[PDB]
C-alpha cells in the first residue's frame, strides 16, 4: 500500500477572483476549501508500466491504463489557495510566505493580464516562490485559437522576466480535462525543496481554534490547536514551544505583548496524527493552552519556536526597500509615491500583517513604529510593503528587516 506521510511540499494556488482557483484544487485532490487560505492535500503517484502524462494518479490505482499493479508512490502533496479578491491581498501575502511553489491561474475566457494577475504574479516574484506553473484554466468554454492567442500574451507578459520559461498548461478545473498534464508538470518544475533539519524549527500561524464539540465537560476540554507551516527545522511531540510575539495585554491602557509558553500534547497533518512535523503541510499542533486564548483563528500572525529559542520581538524595524515603479493591483494604472515621513504602511512579515508609522525614509532604508509587534526569526527575512490608495491596501514594493 501507500504511506501515510505528511505532506512534504506547499504549492500555492493565486490568480485574479473567480479564475478558477478553488475549483482547481478539488479537480487534483477532490476536496473542495471553502476556507480561506483554503487548504487540501493529495498523494501523487506513477503508474510506470504506462504512459505519460496520464501514467501520473492522485490515488493508488492504474486501472485506468489497464495494470492491476499498484502505482509507486512519490509524495505528498499539499495546497494552499490564496483568495483572489484585491481586498484579500493581504490575505494572500500571507499564505504566500507558506508557498515552496505556487501555480498561477489564468481564465481563458477574461482579458489577460487582470490586476491580480498582475499582483499576485510580482508578489510571488518579490518573496521569491519563483517555481511556478501558469495554468490556463477554463479552456472548456473557448476555441483552440482563443486559448492560443492568450498563450501568447503570457508568453509576452513572462518575457524579460524571472518567468520566461515558466510552463503554461491549458485545462478545465471544472469538467477535469487534461489534469494529468498539470500533475505532471507539478513533478517536473515544483520539487520538493532540500530541508536543513538542523536549523531551528520556526512555525508561521495563520490559524487557531477551539476544537471542543458545545456543552463539551469541563474535564473534558481540550486544549487550544494552532495551525500553520514549519518553515524551517522540525517540532515533536511533548516539545517545549512559545508563541510569539504572544498574548496582547491591556495593563490597563498601555498595551504590551507577553509569549505564550505552552507544550506539544499532538501533532495533525489532515486527519492523521504524527509524532514530528516537518517544512510541508498545514500543521495543527495540539497544546495545553485554554482553548479561549486560541479560539476563532485569534492568534494569526504569530510564530511558534522552542521556549529557549531567541527571538527580536519588535515594534520599530529597520527595512532595506525597493519600491515598485507601479501599482500593479489597480485597475487604473497608477505610479507609486516615494515613501513619505508619518505615513502609515502596511507591513507583511512572514504570515503576521501590521500596520505602522514611517518614522525615518532615506533612499534606501526606513524605519517604521509598529501598531503592534512582529517576530522577527531570521536575519534575512522579506516583508511586502503596502500603502492604503483609493480606499483600498495596495502593494507597492518589499524589503529586507534589517537586525
Ligand atoms: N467553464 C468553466 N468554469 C469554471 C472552470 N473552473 C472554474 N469555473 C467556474 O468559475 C467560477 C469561479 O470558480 P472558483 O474556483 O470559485 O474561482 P476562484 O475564486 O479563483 O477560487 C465557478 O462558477 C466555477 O464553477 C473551468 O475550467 N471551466
Ligand atoms: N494536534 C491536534 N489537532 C487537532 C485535535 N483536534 C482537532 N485538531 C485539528 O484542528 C482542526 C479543526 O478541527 P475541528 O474543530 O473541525 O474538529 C483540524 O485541522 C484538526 O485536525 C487534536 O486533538 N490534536
Ligand atoms: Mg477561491
Ligand atoms: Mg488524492
Ligand atoms: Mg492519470
Ligand atoms: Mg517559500
Ligand atoms: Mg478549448
Given at each position: 500500500?501507500?504511506?501515510?506521510?505528511?505532506?512534504?511540499?506547499?504549492?500555492?494556488?493565486?490568480?485574479?477572483?473567480?479564475?478558477?482557483?478553488?475549483?482547481?484544487?478539488?479537480?487534483?485532490?477532490?476536496?473542495?476549501?471553502?476556507?480561506?487560505?483554503?487548504?487540501?492535500?493529495?498523494?501523487?503517484?506513477?503508474?510506470?508500466?504506462?504512459?505519460?502524462?496520464?501514467?501520473?494518479?492522485?490515488?493508488?490505482?492504474?486501472?485506468?491504463?489497464?495494470?492491476?499493479?499498484?502505482?509507486?508512490?512519490?509524495?505528498?502533496?499539499?495546497?494552499?489557495?490564496?483568495?483572489?479578491?484585491?481586498?484579500?491581498?493581504?490575505?494572500?501575502?500571507?499564505?504566500?510566505?507558506?508557498?515552496?511553489?505556487?501555480?498561477?491561474?489564468?481564465?481563458?475566457?477574461?482579458?489577460?493580464?487582470?490586476?491580480?494577475?498582475?499582483?499576485?504574479?510580482?508578489?510571488?516574484?518579490?518573496?521569491?516562490?519563483?517555481?511556478?506553473?501558469?495554468?490556463?484554466?477554463?479552456?472548456?468554454?473557448?476555441?483552440?485559437?482563443?486559448?492560443?492567442?492568450?498563450?501568447?500574451?503570457?508568453?509576452?507578459?513572462?518575457?524579460?522576466?524571472?518567468?520566461?520559461?515558466?510552463?503554461?498548461?491549458?485545462?478545465?478545473?471544472?469538467?477535469?480535462?487534461?489534469?494529468?498534464?498539470?500533475?505532471?508538470?507539478?513533478?517536473?518544475?515544483?520539487?520538493?525543496?532540500?530541508?536543513?533539519?538542523?536549523?531551528?524549527?520556526?512555525?508561521?500561524?495563520?490559524?487557531?481554534?477551539?476544537?471542543?464539540?458545545?456543552?463539551?465537560?469541563?474535564?473534558?476540554?481540550?486544549?487550544?490547536?494552532?495551525?500553520?507551516?514549519?518553515?524551517?527545522?522540525?517540532?515533536?511531540?511533548?516539545?517545549?514551544?512559545?508563541?510569539?510575539?504572544?498574548?496582547?495585554?491591556?495593563?490597563?491602557?498601555?498595551?504590551?505583548?507577553?509569549?505564550?509558553?505552552?507544550?506539544?500534547?499532538?501533532?495533525?497533518?489532515?486527519?492523521?496524527?504524527?509524532?514530528?512535523?516537518?517544512?510541508?503541510?498545514?500543521?495543527?499542533?495540539?497544546?495545553?493552552?485554554?482553548?479561549?486564548?486560541?479560539?476563532?483563528?485569534?492568534?494569526?500572525?504569530?510564530?511558534?519556536?522552542?521556549?529557549?529559542?531567541?527571538?527580536?520581538?519588535?515594534?520599530?524595524?529597520?527595512?532595506?526597500?525597493?519600491?515598485?515603479?507601479?501599482?500593479?493591483?489597480?485597475?487604473?494604472?497608477?505610479?507609486?509615491?516615494?515613501?513619505?515621513?508619518k505615513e502609515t504602511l502596511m507591513l507583511?512579515?512572514?504570515?503576521?500583517?501590521?500596520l505602522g508609522i514611517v518614522?525615518?525614509?532615506?533612499?534606501?532604508?526606513?524605519?517604521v513604529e509598529?501598531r503592534?509587534?512582529?517576530?522577527?526569526?531570521?536575519?534575512?527575512?522579506?516583508?511586502?510593503?503596502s500603502r492604503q490608495?483609493?480606499?483600498?491596501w495596495?502593494?507597492?514594493?518589499?524589503?529586507?528587516?534589517?537586525?
Open positions: 500500500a501507500w504511506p501515510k506521510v505528511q505532506p512534504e511540499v506547499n504549492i500555492g494556488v493565486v490568480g485574479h477572483v473567480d479564475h478558477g482557483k478553488t475549483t482547481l484544487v478539488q479537480a487534483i485532490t477532490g476536496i473542495w476549501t471553502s476556507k480561506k487560505l483554503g487548504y487540501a492535500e493529495t498523494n501523487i503517484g506513477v503508474c510506470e508500466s504506462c504512459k505519460k502524462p496520464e501514467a501520473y494518479v492522485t490515488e493508488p490505482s492504474c486501472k485506468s491504463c489497464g495494470s492491476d499493479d499498484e502505482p509507486k508512490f512519490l509524495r505528498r502533496i499539499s495546497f494552499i489557495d490564496a483568495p483572489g479578491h484585491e481586498v484579500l491581498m493581504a490575505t494572500m501575502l500571507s499564505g504566500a510566505a507558506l508557498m515552496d511553489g505556487a501555480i498561477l491561474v489564468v481564465a481563458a475566457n477574461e482579458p489577460f493580464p487582470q490586476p491580480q494577475t498582475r499582483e499576485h504574479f510580482v508578489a510571488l516574484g518579490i518573496i521569491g516562490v519563483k517555481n511556478l506553473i501558469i495554468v490556463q484554466n477554463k479552456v472548456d468554454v473557448v476555441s483552440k485559437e482563443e486559448a492560443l492567442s492568450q498563450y501568447r500574451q503570457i508568453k509576452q507578459f513572462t518575457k524579460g522576466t524571472w518567468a520566461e520559461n515558466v510552463p503554461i498548461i491549458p485545462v478545465s478545473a471544472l469538467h477535469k480535462i487534461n489534469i494529468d498534464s498539470l500533475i505532471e508538470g507539478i513533478e517536473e518544475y515544483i520539487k520538493t525543496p532540500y530541508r536543513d533539519l538542523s536549523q531551528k524549527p520556526v512555525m508561521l500561524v495563520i490559524r487557531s481554534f477551539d476544537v471542543n464539540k458545545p456543552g463539551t465537560q469541563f474535564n473534558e476540554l481540550k486544549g487550544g490547536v494552532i495551525g500553520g507551516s514549519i518553515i524551517q527545522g522540525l517540532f515533536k511531540v511533548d516539545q517545549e514551544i512559545k508563541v510569539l510575539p504572544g498574548l496582547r495585554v491591556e495593563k490597563q491602557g498601555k498595551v504590551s505583548y507577553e509569549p505564550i509558553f505552552t507544550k506539544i500534547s499532538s501533532i495533525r497533518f489532515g486527519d492523521e496524527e504524527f509524532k514530528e512535523a516537518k517544512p510541508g503541510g498545514l500543521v495543527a499542533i495540539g497544546t495545553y493552552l485554554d482553548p479561549s486564548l486560541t479560539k476563532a483563528d485569534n492568534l494569526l500572525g504569530s510564530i511558534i519556536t522552542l521556549a529557549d529559542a531567541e527571538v527580536p520581538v519588535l515594534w520599530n524595524i529597520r527595512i532595506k526597500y525597493n519600491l515598485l515603479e507601479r501599482v500593479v493591483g489597480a485597475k487604473e494604472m497608477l505610479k507609486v509615491d516615494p515613501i513619505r515621513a507583511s512579515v512572514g504570515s503576521s500583517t501590521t518614522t525615518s525614509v532615506k533612499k534606501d532604508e526606513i524605519e509598529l503592534r509587534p512582529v517576530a522577527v526569526w531570521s536575519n534575512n527575512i522579506r516583508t511586502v510593503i490608495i483609493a480606499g483600498r495596495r502593494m507597492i514594493g518589499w524589503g529586507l528587516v534589517e537586525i
